[PDB]
């Protein structure tokens, strides 16, 4: 069944699993027409497919052309997501195929289950966790490759950079969710915290800056302060 606070350590065991977030697959800007009606213009999207143990991100770029002359796009987005995930699973060798896929949104369960009928041994699971994976398009390098794509494209990342050299998956995943949760609640403030010191850069082959263990503690603390402040504001408490 469902993934929660109670079965959290299961993410970091040795059964291959993937999170799938469909929240940036179908992206629109809403605008006024000359006649003063409202219309949407689709922009490039992405499927966020993450192995939480290894940090391997399968960023499948959804080019706006997939929507051309289709109806009910928010429904189609869930089925296109499931088609792309099924195809990634088929593309992987057997021993790299996941034993579980956890969808961040319950609406993905039937589309993925029907696309995965050929894989009855892969459990499709919802989560009660509120994961901030929607903020993935606040990571500059992930945003850059989505917006520049001229065709459908799969791009492979490690969202933990080289952190697993120094910390466990559990700690790496907590750092990732804290960074994303912060970027989601206040993007500008979050991004200011990450680049304030020009001496700490992002390696060409990384997503985040090259913080020492000490500088990560300071950053993690600044991100936690940002989240609680913004929270006091949201709710006047």
């Amino acid at each position: 069944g469902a993934m929660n606070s109670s079965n959290y350590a299961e993410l970091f065991n040795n059964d291959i699993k993937l999170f799938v977030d469909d929240t940036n697959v179908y992206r629109v800007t809403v605008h006024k027409t000359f006649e003063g009606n409202v219309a949407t213009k689709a922009i490039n999207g992405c499927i966020f497919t993450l192995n939480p143990k290894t940090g391997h991100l399968f960023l499948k770029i959804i080019h706006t052309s997939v929507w051309a002359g289709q109806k009910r796009l928010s429904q189609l987005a869930k089925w296109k997501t499931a088609e792309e995930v099924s195809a990634l699973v088929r593309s992987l060798p057997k021993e790299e195929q996941p034993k579980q896929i956890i969808v961040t949104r319950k609406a993905m369960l039937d589309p993925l289950e029907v696309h995965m009928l050929d894989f009855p041994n892969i459990a499709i699971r919802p989560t009660e966790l509120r994961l901030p994976f929607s903020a993935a398009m606040s990571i500059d390098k992930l945003s850059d490759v989505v917006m520049k794509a001229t065709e459908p494209q799969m791009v492979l990342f490690n969202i933990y950079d080289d952190w697993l050299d120094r910390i466990s998956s559990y700690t790496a995943f907590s750092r990732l969710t804290l960074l994303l949760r912060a970027l989601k609640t206040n993007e500008e403030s979050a991004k200011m915290i990450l680049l304030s010191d020009p001496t700490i850069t992002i390696k060409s082959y990384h997503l985040w800056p090259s913080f020492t263990d000490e500088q990560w503690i300071t950053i993690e603390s600044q991100m936690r302060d940002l989240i609680l402040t913004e929270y006091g504001r949201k709710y006047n408490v």
Binding site: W79, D110, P111, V114
Partner: protein, 300 residues
């Protein structure tokens, strides 16, 4: 007009014949049921006064042999049996009639209810869902599980309804996942109608039999089957006009006959709301929608 004689009634029991029922007291001189209309299947059914658990009964057709009921004090139930001696049977029936120890099938001349509930039901199809091929009649009870129920455990005593599963490779063509899941026309018309049932009549027959097993025995798997078969038609954008018209009529008589007090266990809220209000055929079941809205507005 045919007769199902009873040897005796040694235990207190409510006897059902189709949609009618009669209380019989322990050792009451009851010798059976006469004036049974030829041309339809029939179900004779029992609920013991001392154990209102285990409703059980027998599907039969009087054209296929001479059937009687006899209490078995070992197995503790009323059993249907075939009398192969035609002369012994006419002789038994004529005696009990002369002594007037038989209730008369109480059909009102205007009343087409039983014909309407069994229009497509045929003993030969019942005998394939309920496998016990040494008898010409079919035993069903409350507890019997379906072949599908057993996948998700005694195969001898199962109800072999056609397995319908909306999230199966059978229901879903490779590369038509979203289309075949949101519109089940291909599963209905190619897999089920053309492939397995061969025609609408056999599909309706099994739907009508699943309903009657749900209503008369409170058989839970029969109920699931009845709802699944309705949902497969309603979730199909492409259904022959004649099937939609006949479905409306079938469902109307089933809803009309259901005991008012059993609507809470026999009707699946999600399926009915989906079928009358959300599905492709939401506007194709006028009679069914009118009787459901007027008789069970709570459920909706």
């Amino acid at each position: 007009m045919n007769t199902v004689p009873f040897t005796s009634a040694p235990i207190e029991v409510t006897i059902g014949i189709d949609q009618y029922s009669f209380n019989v007291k322990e050792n009451q001189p009851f010798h059976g049921i006469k004036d049974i209309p030829i041309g339809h299947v029939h179900v004779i059914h029992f609920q013991h006064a001392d154990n209102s658990s285990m409703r059980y009964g027998y599907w039969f057709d009087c054209r296929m042999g001479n059937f009687y009921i006899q209490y078995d004090p070992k197995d503790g139930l009323y059993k249907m049996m075939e009398e192969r001696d035609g002369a012994k049977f006419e002789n038994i029936v004529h005696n009990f009639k002369e002594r007037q120890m038989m209730v008369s099938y109480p059909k009102i001349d205007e009343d087409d209810t039983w014909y309407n509930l069994t229009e497509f039901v045929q003993m030969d199809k019942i005998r394939k869902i309920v496998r016990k091929d040494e008898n010409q009649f079919s035993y069903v009870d409350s507890s019997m599980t379906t072949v599908q129920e057993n996948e998700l455990s005694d195969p001898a005593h199962s109800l072999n309804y056609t397995v319908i599963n909306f999230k199966s490779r059978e229901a879903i063509r490779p590369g038509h996942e979203m289309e075949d899941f949101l519109d089940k026309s291909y599963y209905l018309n190619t897999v089920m109608l053309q492939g397995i049932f061969k025609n609408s009549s056999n599909y309706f027959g099994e739907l009508q039999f699943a309903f009657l097993n749900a209503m008369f025995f409170g058989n839970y798997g029969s109920s699931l089957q009845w709802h699944a078969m309705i949902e497969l038609i309603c979730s199909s954008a492409t259904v022959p006009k004649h099937m939609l018209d006949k479905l409306d009529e079938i469902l109307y008589y089933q809803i009309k006959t259901l005991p008012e007090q059993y609507s809470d266990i026999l009707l699946n809220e999600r399926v009915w709301n989906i079928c009358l209000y959300s599905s492709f055929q939401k506007n194709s079941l006028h009679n069914t929608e009118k009787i459901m809205e007027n008789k069970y507005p709570e459920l909706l």
